[PDB]
């Protein structure tokens, strides 16, 4: 089972830590860095932006995405093709890390997500959500959601048409953008960020939205992300190239 | 007694909150920089305080970011110079608006200093007393803070950036100032929220997992930064501004004037 995830965010925003917390293991890796791991049945490829934010900031991200689409298309056009044996490297989900300023959505993040909306399944997350207290975090979420909806940004939504998963997925959609916290520490057993005044529990829903985000890794949800990638995002790219090739 | 403080940092980095925490008072301003003046009072000692905040700092090219800050600083120097050169001058009836200290807010990334930060502080070193601070330090654990401070100090030293150091010459209190210099860059935490503990008002940031206590030295370096408001330290900041930074500006202008 292949699954490709992209983390877009500024330097030191917590991309690597969240990936480690998500899959409960370390990941060892010039604008993008990708590495493939075999988790035990799941072949995972994690991609992470380098120096992002340091107009054209999103270009290397878009180019990477287009190149994975192109590799798949060329395989699809082959005379002697073997799609089953082919390693799908197309990005199935993009976690867009939003800085916990407590302010509003930055213009760069707005433009970037607008250009990614029809290229990849975009899921916005609030990085280092322990930066913000509970009350102003809900105001910050509402502000972000307001700008996303007003600017008509087509972020990804988990499917709620099937009653078998409607309850889980509707709750997930209500928590978007996910207030995330990552950690490489473990105490008596969960993962925590330990301060002298207290410890943030990653897997505690009263502290952050990590448990909601982790439900993305449910089989039905990963399959939906892959299906939309192939049937919508890839098709958009494919139709464009077929026009060019003629 | 006048004292002018400038806060340089990106949007939402916590400039206004720190100023409120530092002086125990909300500041209401009235567009690259904002400045407002308040009259404060401890017992029977008056203080004419001016706070200055950057606006949208880090949104523009590196040069275009620190340029309005340098221009503001130079402008206060120019106003003082023109008054000093006046025929019918009255230096006592003149409001000295020269910036005495600059708090440069460093984002709590836990990694290194941004390239924009190094260039900015290098441009400000001979214009104003620069004191680097780590903003929102309650978002950094103690092991990561110790390592973060080290890398910051290392890059400042290797780039020959002359940040301000508190005087350790006078017998009392050089002990206090020596400890202050050891804490640079100050790990700062601000808060507009306050509670009453043991009959005293205490500013805190309250999370579901606990509360950060601003005045607690075991939580952040705010108490060390507040020692900048000691009379001897404020006067040293003013003196260096007048005797060193302003004179540097003055000499260049005298040449240009011919
Ligand atoms: N407050 C807070 N700090 C975090 C969190 N997650 C990670 N950090 C810290 O932030 C720093 C950044 O960690 P990384 O995961 O390497 O950030 P990054 O996005 O991978 O940065 P680069 O890949 O180097 O560009 C680390 O020192 C972490 O200890 C979080 O959820 N909350
Ligand atoms: N975690 C944390 N949050 C803080 C701290 N200080 C302020 N904040 C929060 O961060 C947000 C930014 O507050 P401000 O002080 O207005 O930030 P600013 O630098 O003045 O931003 P500008 O609008 O550009 O002036 C506020 O909502 C505060 O609640 C802090 O020390 N730690
Ligand atoms: Mg990383
Ligand atoms: Mg402010």
UniProtKB/Swiss-Prot annotation, chain B:
It comes from the Eukaryota. Mg(2+) is essential for the GTP-binding, but GDP-binding does not require a metal cofactor. GTP binds at residues 12-17, 53, 136-139, 144, 190, 205-207. It is found in: Cytoplasm, Cytoskeleton. Mg(2+) binds at residues 16, 53. Residues 53-56 are annotated as: G3 motif. GO terms for molecular function: GDP binding; GTP binding; identical protein binding; magnesium ion binding; protein heterodimerization activity; protein homodimerization activity. GO terms for cellular component: septin complex; vesicle. One of its GO terms (biological process) is protein homooligomerization. Its main location: cytoplasm. Its cofactor is Mg(2+). Residues 1-256 form the Septin-type G domain. Residues 135-138 are annotated as: G4 motif. GDP binds at residues 12-17, 53, 136-139, 144, 190, 205-207. Stable at wide pH range from 4 to 9. Residues 9-16 are annotated as: G1 motif. The keyword Magnesium applies. Temperature-sensitive. Stable at 15 degrees Celsius. Starts to aggregate at 37 degrees Celsius. Keywords: Coiled coil, Cytoplasm, Cytoskeleton, Glycoprotein, GTP-binding, Magnesium, Metal-binding, Nucleotide-binding. The keyword Lipid metabolism does not apply. C-terminus (307-412) is necessary for binding to liposomal membranes as assessed by phosphatidylinositol-4,5-bisphosphate (PIP2)-containing giant unilamellar vesicles (GUVs), models of biological membranes. Belongs to the TRAFAC class TrmE-Era-EngA-EngB-Septin-like GTPase superfamily. Septin GTPase family. Filament-forming GTP-binding protein. Lacks GTPase activity, which is likely due to absence of an essential threonine residue important for hydrolytic activity in septins. May be involved in membrane remodeling, potentially by its nucleotide-dependent cellular membrane association/dissociation ability. Able to bind to phosphatidylinositol-4,5-bisphosphate (PIP2)-containing giant unilamellar vesicles (GUVs), which serve as a model of biological membranes. Self-assembles into ordered cage-like structures on the vesicle membrane. Septins polymerize into heterooligomeric protein complexes that form filaments, and can associate with cellular membranes, actin filaments and microtubules. Homodimer. Homooligomerizes. Forms (via GTP-binding domain) heterodimers with SEPT5 (via GTP-binding domain) in a nucleotide-dependent manner with GTP promoting heterodimerization most efficiently. Component of the filamentous forming heterocomplex composed of SEPT10, SEPT5 and SEPT7.2. Heterocomplex formation and the filamentous polymerization of the complexes is enhanced by forchlorfenuron (FCF), a synthetic phenylurea cytokinin. This is Septin-10.
